[PDB]
Amino acid sequence: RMVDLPVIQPRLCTHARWPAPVYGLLVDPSLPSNPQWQNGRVHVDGTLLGTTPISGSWVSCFAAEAAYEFQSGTGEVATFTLIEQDGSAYVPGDRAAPLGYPDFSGQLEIEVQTETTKTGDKLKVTTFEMILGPTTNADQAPYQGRVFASVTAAASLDLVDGRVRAVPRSIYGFQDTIPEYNDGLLVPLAPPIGPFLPGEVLLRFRTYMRQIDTADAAAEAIDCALPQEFVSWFASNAFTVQSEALLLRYRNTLTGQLLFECKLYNEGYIALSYSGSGPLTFPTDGIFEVVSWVPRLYQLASVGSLATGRMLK
Amino acid sequence: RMVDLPVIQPRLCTHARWPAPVYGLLVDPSLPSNPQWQNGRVHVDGTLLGTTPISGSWVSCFAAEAAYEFQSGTGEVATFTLIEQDGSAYVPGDRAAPLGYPDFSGQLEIEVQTETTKTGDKLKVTTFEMILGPTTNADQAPYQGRVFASVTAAASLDLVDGRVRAVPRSIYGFQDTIPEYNDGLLVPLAPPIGPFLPGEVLLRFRTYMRQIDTADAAAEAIDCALPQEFVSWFASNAFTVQSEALLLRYRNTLTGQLLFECKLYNEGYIALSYSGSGPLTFPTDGIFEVVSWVPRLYQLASVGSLATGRMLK
DSSP states (O other): OOOOOOOOOGGGSBOSSSSSBOOEEEEOSSSOSSOOOSSSOBOTTSOBOTTOOSSGGGTTOEEEEEEEOOOSSSSOOEEEEEEOTTSOBOOOOSSSSSTTOOOSEEEEEEEEEEOOOSTTOBOOEEEEEEEOSOOSSOOOBTTTTEEEEEEEEESSSSOOOEEEEEEEEEEEEEESSOOOSSTTSOOOOOOOSOOOOTTEEEOEEEEEEEEEETTEEEEEEEEESSOHHHHHHHHHHOOOOOSSEEEEEEEOTTTOOEEEEEEEETTTEEEEEOOOSSOEEOOSSOEEEEEEEEOTTOOOOOOOOSOOOOOOO | OOOOOOOOOGGGSBOSSSSSBOOEEEEOSSSOSSOOOSSSOBOTTSOBOTTOOSSGGGTTOEEEEEEEEEETTTEEEEEEEEEOTTSOBOOOOSSSSSTTOOOSEEEEEEEEEEOOOSTTOBOOEEEEEEEOSOOSSOOOBTTTTEEEEEEOOSSOOOOOOEEEEEEEEEEEEEEOSOOOSBTBSOOOOOOOSOOOOTTEEEOEEEEEEEEEETTEEEEEEEEESSOHHHHHHHHHHOOOOOTTOEEEEEEOTTTOOEEEEEEEETTTEEEEEBOOSSOEEEOSSOEEEEEEEOOTTOOOOOBOOSOOOOOOO
16 A cells, blocks of 8 residues: 555666666766656656656657658658557547657657568668757647658658657757647646755756757767656555655665655656755765655755766865 | 566567667577577566676677787788776676677678767777677687777877777678687577477567668568566566466557467566467567566467458468
8 A cells, every 4th residue: 555666776676767777876066957858757646647658669759640742842742641549549638649759859860660560561761860849830730630740761661651760769859859749729738847945956867968060979968757667666556645745765776875865746847955056966886765754844964976077166 | 576567569669689779579480499699688677698898888788908910912901909888997797898889790891980978089990890700811800809990091090009989880790690709619698599398489560770881771570578677677677586487468558459478487588489480570569568487488469460361282
């Protein structure tokens, strides 16, 4: 009956916003304090929010029927009439897009393959680039079930069409801000993450995206509030909630070293007490242990950087 | 306590042997009855077997210290000194390879990228071909921590030696038998799946790999005993077991329809009683519900094909 957590190290976890392993664990107060992320969002009681999928393989992916219409500038624009990734029809409802749809902006390179239904299905593979963010009006409406992308590479020599699946490859001009999901119109969104007590900052699980630039490719950070294993854990257990937050300890179980305490708020984000200005990273080889229910106003033991050097200045 | 299962439909799950969604759920008695899969293996009491990772982002992937050398007539040849995918050192131990290492044979196209440690790290990407099975003359020895791959090339590529992560792209000449992990030497392996009673057959959760050839590509099936979400469920829960199996019912929750019953043997594989010769597929929109502990000798209600047609010969 009491909430517990799986004893899984962050470095062994799956990322909830880009389909890759978790590499980092940190707080940063220079970043936006209350992000509006649509994936990786669940309450402690198991209520999934936004576009958050159960399966980590759905993260920042989509599925569609693909069809073509020719275009003047860039050749060969595909129209993608979205479907949910399990092949079921997508119906505009009470979330921003199909489950696992990307919840950030920039120009995404996606690889698109013919839907696989049985051994022997002939498969085509085509790479596209897709503009996720507002861009004035583009007729990007993933809420309404229709998005567009331009061909960048044929792997196949026969352009992919029909029912397809799209996976993310790399990003250009990444901005961690949600994309126009519904043109200019109001869309259903999980709320900004928060609020935090004074001195509290969001615990971030970090992975890296291949970001392209002029004649260089470099890692670009993307954060989520909980790893996918914790998202599906809460969804699957549907625990009864008894306070506003849980007090957690993050501990290395081999050595016994207690690393920090933190607060998991019932709305599915974790807070650390930290007064520094720059990023503070933690080891990713500890485990989270639930300690007890605590009230909102519970004051955490603070953490700080292990580098103690300072200057007179 | 009280062993239960997450209410997750198969079509919403992640596969445990190839990094992609589950698409199919079926029995085939024409397939090998007792496969020796190394990934997707876990006991109901939470004991992980073989090379089974927690994270589905680890499945059929590896990480390595890459060293590169050119050979005329062949191309660039990569020597990969294996590490675990979290970056920790790989030590040959009580399993056949680093966690999540491919557990089947054939020639695998891998995409290899510089390891992502922090934002700004410059990234290079190259596609290699890696022969998994005996594959003629090589010291393919993932158990000892060293594997080789190549790319056909007219002259040297620019390749810098360093830490990499490798992900699977396509397969050629797929065979679902384990690779030679340790040359001609004995190696630690999860046992063959089984035994089954007379008339019982393995339940297969199915996904599809891109299997290639010249200017052609087709879906090729691969099966696993449990989706990854069930693998991480039993590992995280560490349930106390009783008896020799759990009786489960697979049901559609929207219609209420009971589809079949099956036995989840405590050693982590599911049987169904089926006397047909050909494949029998099932809908992937049901849920598995735990009904009871049962003995090894428990006789399941049989299933059969929904097509009743027969000819007088």
